[PDB]
């Protein structure tokens, strides 16, 4: 494959118990790290905030710095590919872990994720749809091995009341074939990024920014 | 239903990105809280340490104190349910999530779980089939609402090396009828375990021992 | 050297930038893991909770099962010592940490705790003194070398408004000589403990039972 | 009151039960976020890794963007202050937390900071002297209320074995007036920092490089 353009995403799991089901396609610019998506309900209204989709709702589109592929983009351009588990721990005690695969076909990525959250208070912000943005972020990212990638950031929205909800959040990629020794030499990488989403209870409409940086200006 | 009797397990997922998948059936007691499994792989050798399935491989073979039903018991008694997530962060990196689901036919129970593991050290004791046996363990519950459990344990097993290998482990379970009010009066509630586990690389032979209490003796 | 009949204690640090200091005695029974503490201000009435000074305001008096000393008493016996590091990490974001020692004269003890706490936030329990009971605990000792404990539970408050208040606990208690062979074969250790406090602004009153075991019945 | 030009450190406590205590002098530019430090031992040889005393080894030498003065300079600046508490937890089970504290005149700071680590292993990196560098950091700083920061940042040093030593790194800083509401809106702040240090088993000899930043470019 070359880098990616367009994408689809199925993702589909379950909040407090309550299914739920999104399907939808964006695009994105992989030399600049934006991408965007749009996604639709199939299975009714959501129950739960749109916002807690974020981080999960594609790391092909992420160059690294100076237009060198990231690992993410040399997996896919050799088509031997990677997958993510995610898990966020959230301030007061709900959690939630995601399963991510691809599937490509030359420029286009094919997305199936798969979530469980459990333990959201029915007054907390998730469940009473009060996430109102989340902050800008800094992903410090280590490898461990020759296949492996261990990232973790602190993760904050904004809500309707002004406090601020937090929780801890650890992504390991798994990689089909190892990582090039030229990308294992560079640690640790941080990865600044941006998010918007506007919503319904049925639709999302979600961007990203996002930039790779050992050092500062 | 009454009381369960025997039960069938169906799990499967991927650890460090390699599937796996287990069948078999077991039964137990539910006056005692004793219960055995069988369990035989579907595809091939596991490569990792069949230890870390384990607290994985039925909450409803455990009675509350003095005879009473546990929330389990009852969710299944009145055929209301449960489901279970649990997530386990290991001291090294690696964590590894499960989600967990039941059905009922009369005096049998049949589970069908799904898990991800990832992040487990080439040399670290999972990898290298270095576990010996698990830890004794006391889960305290809390139910912070009215259909909800939220356990913790601190997890430890025994390794051929002699230094233990630890998790921190939080088990939120959602039911679908609110749980009776005369068990959501008694908080905390403490479970005491034991397991065994034999094993080879593609079967395993499991046994639990629980017992609740308030207090001791 | 006898087992303790009667202690004081001096501790003191400050909560969220205020400094407090507080003193007294106190007495208990080393067979039956009994004991109890008055203590009164040094410097005014204290502006938190003083249900955040529990768990830290003495294991000299704590028993192992059969009569056997636990190791706590063993050092005090042969004069050699402890001291214990404590950490409470809170549900929103606040930390504590102490700093406890021990000097011993025939069967009196004198600690001298220091204390620091921070980010509880304004409208909290802990500042609004809405705190109004600590839940029975289980606390799990494991020893991961010859003079070393490492010990945790999940502690939780009940406050007025009906939700609790939870933080994660970790002891790390180190000896000045080695811990008996026969102590350290038995892990896990548990204990069991209950609490009570009466307080004012400016005094506590303060009771424990304690009592250790390996297994239940 | 001018920003920092020299400053002076007391450094003491214990680590794994043994008493250090360091005193030295350094200097540094507040406009450019440079400092350096020299640490001379009190009490013969350390007998743990000096690395582990880093970061605790003066945020007043931060300015923030464009010229302003970080909320540490402020507090220094007008005389009213702050303390730090902050929280160290090692993925080794090993813990150290330290309590800031600081005297100025004229442009001269005096630090009394108290540090008490435990649980470190005896042959775990930090005994057996084994850490190389830290890594560099990216803090990010939130304010839940108009005098407190809170900052986390995962903390990770390269040791002789090329296996990197991690852990959870919380500081909370607390203000005896209001930070302005300038600095209160702008968050998060993220805070770039290196560090070098060479030592003995007597003397330390620091330097940090530190740059404050809310997005890159």
């Known amino acids: 494959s070359p880098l990616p353009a367009t994408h689809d995403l199925h993702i589909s799991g379950s909040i407090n118990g309550h299914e739920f089901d999104l399907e939808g396609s964006g695009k994105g610019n992989a030399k600049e790290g934006y991408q965007?998506?749009?996604?639709?309900?199939?299975?009714?209204?959501?129950?739960?905030?749109?916002?807690?989709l974020v981080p999960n709702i594609f790391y092909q589109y992420l160059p690294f710095?100076?237009?060198?592929?990231?690992?993410?983009?040399?997996?896919?351009?050799?088509?031997?590919?990677?997958?993510?588990?995610?898990?966020?721990?959230?301030?007061?005690?709900?959690?939630?872990?995601?399963?991510?695969?691809?599937?490509?076909?030359?420029?286009?990525?094919?997305?199936?994720?798969?979530?469980?959250?459990?333990?959201?208070?029915?007054?907390?912000?998730?469940?009473?749809?009060?996430?109102?943005?989340?902050?800008?972020?800094?992903?410090?990212?280590?490898?461990?091995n020759d296949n492996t990638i261990i990232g973790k950031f602190d993760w904050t929205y904004t809500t309707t009341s002004g406090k601020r909800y937090q929780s801890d959040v650890q992504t390991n990629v798994t990689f089909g074939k190892p990582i090039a020794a030229d990308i294992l030499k560079k640690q640790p990488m941080f990865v600044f990024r941006k998010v918007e989403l506007k919503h319904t209870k049925t639709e999302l409409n979600f961007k990203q920014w996002q930039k790779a940086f050992q050092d500062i200006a």
Chains 1, 2, 3, 4 share one sequence.
């Open 65 to 144: 710095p100076d237009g060198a592929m990231s690992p993410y983009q040399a997996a896919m351009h050799d088509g031997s590919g990677y997958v993510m588990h995610r898990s966020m721990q959230f301030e007061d005690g709900a959690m939630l872990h995601s399963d991510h695969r691809y599937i490509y076909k030359g420029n286009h990525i094919k997305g199936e994720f798969r979530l469980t959250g459990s333990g959201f208070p029915a007054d907390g912000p998730v469940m009473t749809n009060s996430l109102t943005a989340a902050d800008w972020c800094v992903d410090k990212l280590l490898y461990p």
């Open 36 to 52: 965007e998506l749009h996604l639709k309900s199939n299975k009714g209204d959501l129950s739960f905030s749109p916002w807690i």
